[PDB]
Amino acid sequence: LWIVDLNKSDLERLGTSWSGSITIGDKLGVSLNQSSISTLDGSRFIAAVNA
Amino acid sequence: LEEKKQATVVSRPVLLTQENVPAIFDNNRTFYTKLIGERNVALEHVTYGTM
Secondary structure: OOOOOOOOOOOOOOEEOOEEEEEEOOOEEEEEOOOOHHHOOOOOOEOOEEO | OOOOOOOOOOOOOOOOOOOOOOOOOOEEEEEEEOOOOOOOOOOEEEEEEEO
16 A cells, blocks of 8 residues: 655745833823833833734 | 734545445644744644544
8 A cells, every 4th residue: 555645845934923002291191012111111112023 | 903814724535445344534733823032932822534
């Protein structure tokens, strides 16, 4: 009997995804994408690229 | 945030017998995919069963 296998796969990943927060005058805090201000006050918004 | 997801998968088993006799086929491969990172290391995998 003859077992035989062939496998073939390719995959690509590209793009960014952003997060983080800003602050204005200790009066208002704007956050992007679930960044809690209760852990960060002056840490400005970051990014992440995958390639 | 917004996105558009679309995926297809088409699979087929083949098998033969004689007439008036039973037969069984079953199969399960595990498909891996490359999570981004080699020292920051992790995997994820899905088994795909058929009977």
